[PDB]
Write a protein that binds this ligand. Structure first.
Ligand SMILES: *[C@@H]1O[C@H](CO)[C@@H](O[C@@H]2O[C@H](CO)[C@@H](O)[C@H](O)[C@H]2NC(C)=O)[C@H](O)[C@H]1NC(C)=O
Lengths: 12, 188, 181
């Protein structure tokens, strides 16, 4: 029905 | 008669205080936030009736909920450490110009504007002095103006009535400065 | 919420252009966004791109998610359109106005919704196309928007500038004026 948000991050 | 338009918004917010990281997550139809994850809560909670089909279904699914609980230490604290190496250490020095608002007579009332530009971060202290004494009244500040380019700007005006020989000094205290910076203006 | 600093990923999708946008802000200043057409990450300052990087897939994916829940919410709300919140516009210079020293004129459009907007830099009635730039549709914590528009110029006592704004919440184009001295 509704998709959850994806959590990424900045990487060096 | 506005054209047809439907807007969906999303916000992933990390709150860093002390040593902590509070993960907020907001699901937003138009300008209404309906579903939300709060790390202090541990599960999705519908803010409005619009988000009940999601909050209950997203909850009780362990693969999603466990990923979301580990976010404060997986991207929040992780990004924050990356920001402390670069973003926090950015220090741009305030440039200070002083001028009257309008030019004209001497004994006529006027406004002395201390224009502080292009500094970062935004926490700045501006003070006014007349003949060595802090003017604690008649100070009109257009509080902190964000420029949208990682630089701030502020105008601090003093209600003055300049006499011949009067000396006005603007003092600026910013984290990017070792000592207060002063700019002077004499009435002549 | 008490916080020394706030680190907010923010994104939106809508029917008209801009159809999508994805960015990350640190203390309400945009650090980087994801060009959804060129499929790339764009860092606001060289200080940033010299240090870290971002998976442009993480933005494009969140946009497809945002689009999937855009619908299923269009339908769930019986096709609810939001009110056109009209913009507030300010025009101010970047540096003190010294006649001769090149400057940057800032047009700040604030407190508007939806994120659809036309902006035109007018010098003496005529529009300016060369030497202009603009920020993104920047989200606010009350889920409206604000935008920044920039024009580099040399202060002339013979010149006059306007920032013309079009929004569905305005009856006519809004003209905000700035003048030297
Ligand atoms: C930005 O400008 C365009 C065109 O300059 C506007 O598009 C017009 O919109 C009106 C009503 O919204 C229509 O009747 C016209 O046919 C459109 N013309 C074109 C060429 O698209 C657009 O509405 C403006 N944006 C805003 C927010 O006002």
């Amino acid at each position: 029905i509704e998709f959850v948000f994806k959590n990424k991050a900045k990487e060096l | 008669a506005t054209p047809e338009n439907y807007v969906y918004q999303g916000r992933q917010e990390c709150y860093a205080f002390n040593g902590t990281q509070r993960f907020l997550e907001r699901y937003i139809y138009n300008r209404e936030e309906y579903a939300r994850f709060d790390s202090d809560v541990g599960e999705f909670r519908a803010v409005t009736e619009l988000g009940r089909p999601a909050a209950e279904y997203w909850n009780s699914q362990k693969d999603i909920l466990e990923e979301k609980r580990a976010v404060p230490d997986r991207v929040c604290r992780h990004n924050y450490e990356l920001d402390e190496a670069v973003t926090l250490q950015r220090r741009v020095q305030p440039k200070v110009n002083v001028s009257p608002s309008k030019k004209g007579p001497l004994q006529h009332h006027n406004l002395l504007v201390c224009h502080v530009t292009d500094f970062y971060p935004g926490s700045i202290q501006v003070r006014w002095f007349l003949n060595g004494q802090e003017e604690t009244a008649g100070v009109v500040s257009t509080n902190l103006i964000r420029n949208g380019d990682w630089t701030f700007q502020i105008l601090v005006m003093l209600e003055m009535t300049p006499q011949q020989g009067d000396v006005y000094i603007c003092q600026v205290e910013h984290t990017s400065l070792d000592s207060p910076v002063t700019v002077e203006w004499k009435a002549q | 919420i008490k916080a020394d600093h706030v680190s907010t990923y923010a994104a939106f999708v809508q029917t008209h252009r801009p159809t999508g946008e994805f960015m990350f802000e640190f203390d309400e200043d945009e650090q980087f966004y994801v060009d959804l057409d060129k499929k790339e990450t764009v860092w606001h300052l060289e200080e940033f791109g010299r240090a870290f990087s971002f998976e442009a897939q993480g933005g494009l994916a969140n946009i497809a998610i945002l689009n999937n829940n855009l619908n299923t919410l269009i339908q769930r709300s019986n096709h609810t359109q939001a009110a056109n919140d009209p913009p507030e516009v300010t025009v101010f210079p970047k540096e003190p106005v010294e006649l001769g020293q090149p400057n940057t004129l800032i047009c700040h459009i604030d407190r508007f919704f939806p994120p659809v907007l036309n902006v035109t830099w007018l010098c003496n009635g005529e529009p300016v196309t060369e030497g202009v730039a603009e920020s993104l549709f920047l989200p606010r914590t009350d889920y409206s928007f604000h935008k920044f528009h920039y024009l580099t110029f040399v202060p002339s006592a013979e010149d006059v500038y306007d920032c013309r704004v079009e929004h569905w919440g305005l009856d006519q184009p809004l003209l905000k004026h700035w003048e030297a001295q």
